[PDB]
Amino acid sequence: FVVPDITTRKNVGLSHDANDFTLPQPLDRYSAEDHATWATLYQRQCKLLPGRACDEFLEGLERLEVDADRVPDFNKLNEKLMAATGWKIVAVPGLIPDDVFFEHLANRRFPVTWWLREPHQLDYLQEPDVFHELFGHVPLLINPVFADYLEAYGKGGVKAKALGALPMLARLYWYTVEFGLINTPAGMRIYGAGILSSKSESIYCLDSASPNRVGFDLMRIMNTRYRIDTFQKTYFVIDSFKQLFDATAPDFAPLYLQLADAQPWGAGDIAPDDLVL
Numbered sequence: 001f002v003v004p005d006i007t008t009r010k011n012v013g014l015s016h017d018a019n020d021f022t023l024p025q026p027l028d029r030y031s032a033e034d035h036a037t038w039a040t041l042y043q044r045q046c047k048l049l050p051g052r053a054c055d056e057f058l059e060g061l062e063r064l065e066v067d068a069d070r071v072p073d074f075n076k077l078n079e080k081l082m083a084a085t086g087w088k089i090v091a092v093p094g095l096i097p098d099d100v101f102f103e104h105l106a107n108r109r110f111p112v113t114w115w116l117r118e119p120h121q122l123d124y125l126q127e128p129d130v131f132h133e134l135f136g137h138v139p140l141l142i143n144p145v146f147a148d149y150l151e152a153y154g155k156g157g158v159k160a161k162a163l164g165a166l167p168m169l170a171r172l173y174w175y176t177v178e179f180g181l182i183n184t185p186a187g188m189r190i191y192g193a194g195i196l197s198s199k200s201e202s203i204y205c206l207d208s209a210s211p212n213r214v215g216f217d218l219m220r221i222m223n224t225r226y227r228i229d230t231f232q233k234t235y236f237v238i239d240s241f242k243q244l245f246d247a248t249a250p251d252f253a254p255l256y257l258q259l260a261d262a263q264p265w266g267a268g269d270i271a272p273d274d275l276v277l
């Protein structure tokens with residue numbers, strides 16, 4: 001039997017803008033259970049993440065006043081975010097078209113799935129939900145260097161789509177924004193949103209001998225496959241958010257055409273020129 005997925009179930013009776021796929025955050029659809037599930041996830045992650053999350057992430061939660069006890073009001077968070085970096089979050093039903101996603105980031109709008117997992121899925125949800133996309137992705141948007149990286153990333157969507165290279169950018173996003181690590185003199189820390197919202201990946205990614213930790217390299221990353229249904233076999237490590245922003249400076253067009261005919265690295269591969277940490 002095929003049954004409707006969570007995105008479909010949650011958006012029953014709702015709509016979205018035809019062009020940008022946004023809707024006003026539907027605050028009336030959040031139940032008591034939703035606020036309680038949010039509070040449980042927030043409390044869980046805030047216990048796990050000290051000494052694991054990069055300091056900027058934890059500071060961003062505080063500066064944006066991300067609610068600990070309820071699903072945040074996007075408009076209220078935006079007052080803080082706009083003043084900091086001119087960014088805002090916009091509500092979306094779930095997955096949106098790539099060109100729209102990129103156009104959002106290019107215009108300093110960060111799309112956030114509005115709905116939350118059910119408490120029976122506290123441990124993990126495959127689909128991005130509002131906990132992953134707000135708690136995991138948004139706090140670093142008050143960092144002007146990271147925000148500028150996302151903007152530059154967004155702006156690259158037009159050229160990438162024109163050249164059939166959106167999957168090459170998707171790899172860059174995955175291995176930075178979603179699953180990136182940042183080395184510090186205090187030790188390795190986490191900036192990837194997919195790790196920051198996870199129950200257990202933040203333990204594995206710093207404590208396990210199993211995954212590879214490889215220095216950031218743009219071409220390597222854009223030539224590396226990923227999988228969505230398992231902990232990462234490889235994490236890419238930056239020294240600074242400036243490294244990400246600066247990586248967007250050159251013309252990606254000739255990089256895409258070179259990659260197009262190449263065989264990609266497997267998710268668990270170490271490449272001959274990797275700086276292995």
Ligand SMILES: [Co+2]
Binds near residue numbers: 137178193194
């Ligand atoms: Co994400």
